[PDB]
Amino acid sequence: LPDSVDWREKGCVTEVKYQGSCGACWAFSAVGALEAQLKLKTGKLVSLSAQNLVDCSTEKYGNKGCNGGFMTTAFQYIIDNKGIDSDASYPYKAMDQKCQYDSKYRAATCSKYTELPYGREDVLKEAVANKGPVSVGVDARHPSFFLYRSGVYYEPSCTQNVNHGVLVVGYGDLNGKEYWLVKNSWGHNFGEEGYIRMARNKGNHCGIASFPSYPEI
Ligand SMILES: C[C@@H](CNc1ccc(OC(F)(F)F)cc1)NC(=O)[C@H](CS(=O)(=O)Cc1ccccc1)NC(=O)N1CCOCC1
Numbered sequence: 001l002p003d004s005v006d007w008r009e010k011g012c013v014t015e016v017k018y019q020g021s022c023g024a025c026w027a028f029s030a031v032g033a034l035e036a037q038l039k040l041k042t043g044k045l046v047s048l049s050a051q052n053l054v055d056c057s058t059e060k061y062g063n064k065g066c067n068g069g070f071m072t073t074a075f076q077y078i079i080d081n082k083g084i085d086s087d088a089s090y091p092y093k094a095m096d097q098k099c100q101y102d103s104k105y106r107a108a109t110c111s112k113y114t115e116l117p118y119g120r121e122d123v124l125k126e127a128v129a130n131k132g133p134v135s136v137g138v139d140a141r142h143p144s145f146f147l148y149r150s151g152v153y154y155e156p157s158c159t160q161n162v163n164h165g166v167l168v169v170g171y172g173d174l175n176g177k178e179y180w181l182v183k184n185s186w187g188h189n190f191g192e193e194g195y196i197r198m199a200r201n202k203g204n205h206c207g208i209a210s211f212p213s214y215p216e217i
């Protein structure tokens with residue numbers, strides 16, 4: 001496998017989004033994953049509608065809109081619905097709305113998704129190198145996460161119990177300190193232009209490899 005991977009360099013990652021006061025991290029993680037696959041499968045990169053997921057991937061998928069959700073079941077909604085709209089056509093409003101999906105504005109599809117085995121940072125690495133960005137859950141419930149500015153993030157109080165959906169878009173090392181390159185959805189003023197480099201191969205730090213999944217077009 002490559003020593004470092006950064007899918008931003010392949011034009012597979014859109015601009016970091018600003019979720020506002022809506023707990024839609026799961027929906028951003030999920031669209032971010034499928035955005036990469038769109039680019040890989042079609043050569044087109046188009047930000048996809050996180051709002052579509054918030055509004056439409058609801059009770060049946062175990063999701064509660066601005067009150068949280070799951071990336072896997074967001075992918076299943078996209079599978080079931082045979083599409084998801086572009087962000088531009090169905091823009092993000094940081095709130096719960098009536099479902100307003102329109103097949104006319106479909107910008108991507110999803111045929112399947114794959115769940116990675118619990119805690120396997122090695123398998124996550126392989127998936128990232130060979131499949132694309134991977135949706136993951138992390139334990140972000142720590143001031144250090146919220147306040148992250150730069151460098152490789154390590155929080156000794158982290159557990160493997162996830163509560164925040166983010167997107168692993170790469171991995172590397174910072175002068176030998178290995179990291180996951182994580183795209184968050186708290187605006188580009190969070191971290192390093194909206195990214196956080198999270199400790200890699202430090203015992204499933206903050207649950208990053210607890211529940212990885214990636215969709216396919
Ligand atoms: C609401 C949002 C908030 N995430 C978050 C976590 C820590 C935070 O701490 C702070 F403020 F310090 F950064 C801030 C925000 N979390 C989620 O959407 C999380 C996303 S999740 O935790 O990634 C879902 C998940 C994925 C894979 C395996 C298990 C769980 N879902 C969620 O809370 N749900 C699911 C549906 O039922 C309601 C509960």
Ligand SMILES: [Cl-]
Pocket residue numbers: 022023024025164
């Ligand atoms: Cl959040």
Ligand SMILES: [Zn+2]
Pocket residue numbers: 139140141142157158159
């Ligand atoms: Zn914690």
Ligand SMILES: [Zn+2]
Pocket residue numbers: 023024025026163164165
């Ligand atoms: Zn969250």
Ligand SMILES: [Zn+2]
Pocket residue numbers: 015016188193
């Ligand atoms: Zn920016």
